[model samples]
Target: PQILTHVIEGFVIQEGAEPFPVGRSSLLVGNLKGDKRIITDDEIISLSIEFFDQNRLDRKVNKDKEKSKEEVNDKRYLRCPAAMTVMHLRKFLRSKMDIPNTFQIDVMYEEEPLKDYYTLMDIAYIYTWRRNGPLPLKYRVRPTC
Candidate 1:
């Protein structure tokens, strides 16, 4: 006798509806068993984030610099680490907009890994079509000294 079971693990965000139907590409259903609900558009837009690792850039530049130098120095330098990179990204997002709980984002690693010789950091931007929160706009500000 053979028994088969499948477990779905990952991120999910609903857009506009609930009780998601079968075979939806964009919709992510984490642990698709119980408590199934349609992800809202707001949730999708709010939680979405992209990470880019720029460690390679630093390594390449440093390597080239060393090649040109006839003398080698034993000085050690550290650039932005992975943890810091993630923290910065989260902070930047928090400062720019108010991300609601409605949307959820699963980070799909798109950037290449940094070499061991160098530290890498990333810059990310959150894009949304329309603004719907209590964030102040620079244009609306009255001039004050």
Candidate 2:
């Protein structure tokens, strides 16, 4: 049998290419540090989201003024309890990003469709198997025309 028992090595999360987001969850990962259980109602999840500009021309023009090092994407770090609704998160970003009322925001992971009614735990469990690193995400906005 090739089944190998693996212990948590800091429970590293993941980083995505067309993906990932914002912050260190208060809950500790691994099979240690009060992590005696798999999932709980009070557990927190960290997400790092990168909001990029869709306008390629403006992006190119802006890039000319700024050199390497400083990133051009709008990055934000946030933490939320697993119990919160995805709808709450959707609106939270709207306010935090100061997104215009006329624009529509799209939040996703690996191009997966994230339902607004689902709890944060729904999203957390998807990445829990990642083994503690950086769980990245992406967010983009469209100007309502």
Candidate 3:
């Protein structure tokens, strides 16, 4: 897994992309301290757990709806793991991988949806940060890269 970091000039990273690319401007909503917050590896793991849980619940709900003669495949708001998987890359930071000190990570995923199959690929992690910022303005946990 590769960790991608980026400091938004003034925005939060949002969802949606034909194939999201790292370092591109996007919407982000989360607690920001210092210049930014290094989303820890732990958070990514937690997010994966949540994503799978939600997926399972949705499957069960879909089955029930089918039995009742309702829409069988109502995929409204069916969550995907793109964002969380990107976040999981932060583990490289937690593991003290040789990374820059700017403390930023931006990631993108290339997804190919076939007629009956789908594939997701890791494109890259674009890293960035602002120079004029407070020392504590950055929240990161690095072993010593």
- Using Cα atoms with residue i matched to residue i, what is each candidate's TM-score against the true structure? 0.18, 0.55, 0.19
User: What tens digits encode model 3's per-residue C-alpha lDDT throughout 63-136?
Assistant: 55455655342211111232333344343332334556544433221121111111111221222323221101
The candidate scoring highest on TM-score is 2
The best candidate in terms of lDDT? 2
Cα RMSD for candidates in order: 20.0, 12.6, 17.9
What tens-digit string does per-residue lDDT give for candidate 2 at 83-117? 76656655666765678879987777656657777
**Per-residue lDDT of 1-145 in model 1, one digit per residue for the tens?**
1222222122221211122224345444443332225222222222223222233354544466665554432211111122233323333333334444444322222322222222111211222222232111111111233
Span of ten consecutive residues with least summed lDDT in model 2 = 1-10
The superposed Cα distance between candidate 1 and the true structure at residue 130, in angstroms, equals: 36
**Model 2 error, position 62 (Å):** 16
Query: What C-alpha lDDT values do all the predictions have?
Result: 0.27, 0.55, 0.27
Model 2 spans > 4 angstroms off: 1-36, 52-74, 127-131
